[PDB]
Amino acid sequence: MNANLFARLFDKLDDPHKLAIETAAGDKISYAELVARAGRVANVLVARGLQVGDRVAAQTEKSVEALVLYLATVRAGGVYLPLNTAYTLHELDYFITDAEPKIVVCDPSKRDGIAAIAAKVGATVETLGPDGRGSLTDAAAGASEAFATIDRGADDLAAILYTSGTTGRSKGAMLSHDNLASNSLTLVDYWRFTPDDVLIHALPIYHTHGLFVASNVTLFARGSMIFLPKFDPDKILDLMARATVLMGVPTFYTRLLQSPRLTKETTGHMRLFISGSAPLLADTHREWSAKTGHAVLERYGMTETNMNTSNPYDGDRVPGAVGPALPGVSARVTDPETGKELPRGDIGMIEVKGPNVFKGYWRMPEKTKSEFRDDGFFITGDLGKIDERGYVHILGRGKDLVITGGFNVYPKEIESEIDAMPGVVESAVIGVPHADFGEGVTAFVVLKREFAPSEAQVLHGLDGQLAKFKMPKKVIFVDDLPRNTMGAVQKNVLRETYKDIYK
Ligand SMILES: Nc1ncnc2c1ncn2[C@@H]1O[C@H](COP(=O)(O)OP(=O)(O)OP(=O)(O)O)[C@@H](O)[C@H]1O
Ligand SMILES: [Mg+2]
């Protein structure tokens, strides 16, 4: 009856000695051992001033100790607030001032600088390094394992995750215990996770994917994970011989496809490859199936909504689509302006509703109101369509739409045309200010080493395929596209760098 996520996970534990986590060093941690670790750390949090509802902010390198801190925070009735490991002291100041955590956990090498920030809000600072050592660990070594998991209701907060910051300054999403439990429980069934599953976990844990989807699904299912610090293709390829699931982002798949070790034989023990967090291109899906014989399962979620849709485990996994709405989740497509639902197949704003959807943005009630329809649907900001079979197709972010000379131009279809050309690795299409057209469609293209065409050849190639209003006004060759630490393209970086090209 306790809705606390920790209690949902562990209050009844039938097989306590089963493996939960293998660390990168090869240490093995049982379910019972994980629970006990979380008990010690929960007691530390209370000993360091945690009261129910208080935020615990964590910026640390990835380790099992860092995962335990998440579980312990939730267990103790706190609100877990992970922060991108790369955020500078200056950047952290915004998040700590916004969230006003009671406790901040950071890397030992940054304690002095973070202590000064923490002082502004009266927070206590503990440390945890990449080896799992630090003041938090010292405090936990003498703490009691026994901890009475705090009573929480379905709608009480478990975490605040800040969005990735792709379209603007990151916003804090308030996530409840039921948001997290309902979503992972649904996914366990939908993806047929069992106690026999072994997940290769190579994702960051400050993002919803690596933190909630990977960890909560595995732990509810009573499977295990192999907990790697970063993406390493050869290590991942090595582990596939003794694992069953990989959760990845599209860049995992494009990079693994460059390895000559990626074969049917190397992947033959694997049950399931999942992709999320950015668009898996249909060509990449097909390349994966051609090389390995596996059909990648793509799913779509956001910080604010957890997972909304998924390609079916036991049905057609459709290249370029993110699947139908998950059980319990409603998805529709609406006219961006009027908000009325569109006929199936028409392009508009994707909206979602369900127990997965967050409670709003932290201390931003006005912005929260503006992103919810009157009937409770959340406006995703993603444009797309739902086909006759109910599969959602994401055509792009609303923020990426380019208005030029009175026309709406959808960059994905221009990017598709360019990426189809021989000698092209990938492209990003944006608008930047243009005195004649409002915005000028501009294509940034990453070329292959040998087979590369010129600016003019690209435009000539597009001229035959594309209506005149959709044509890029210029093509710019770049060495790579800017991406965040999760692998998502950062089009605002290109918009800033190239803002004056038509001036
Ligand atoms: N499978 C997918 N296919 C296409 N787009 C995806 C997929 N998964 C995630 N996305 C995109 O990523 C977004 C969610 O990313 P996240 O919550 O990490 O922050 P962000 O939207 O990148 O940053 P911010 O909200 O701060 O601008 C989605 O709204 C969508 O635009
Ligand atoms: Mg977003």
Automatic annotation (TrEMBL):
The gene is matB. Pfam families: AMP-binding, AMP-binding_C. GO terms for molecular function: ATP binding; medium-chain fatty acid-CoA ligase activity. Residues 413-488 form the AMP-binding enzyme C-terminal domain. Its EC number is 6.2.1.44. It comes from the Bacteria. This is 3-methylmercaptopropionyl-CoA ligase. ATP binds at T163, S164, G165, T166, T167, H207, S277, E298, R299, T303, D382, R397. Residues 16-362 form the AMP-dependent synthetase/ligase domain. The keyword Ligase applies. It catalyses: 3-(methylsulfanyl)propanoate + ATP + CoA = 3-(methylsulfanyl)propanoyl-CoA + AMP + diphosphate. SUPFAM superfamilies: Acetyl-CoA synthetase-like. Keywords: ATP-binding, Ligase, Nucleotide-binding. Gene3D superfamilies: 3.30.300.30, N-terminal domain of ligase-like (3.40.50.12780). It comes from Rhodopseudomonas palustris (strain ATCC BAA-98 / CGA009). GO terms for biological process: fatty acid metabolic process. The modification N6,N6-dimethyllysine is found at residues 12, 18, 28, 62, 102, 110, 120, 171, 230, 235, 264, 291, 340, 353, 359, 367, 369, 385, 399, 412, 468, 470, 473-474, 491, 499, 503. Belongs to the ATP-dependent AMP-binding enzyme family. PANTHER family: ACYL-COA SYNTHETASE, ACYL-COA SYNTHETASE FAMILY MEMBER 3.
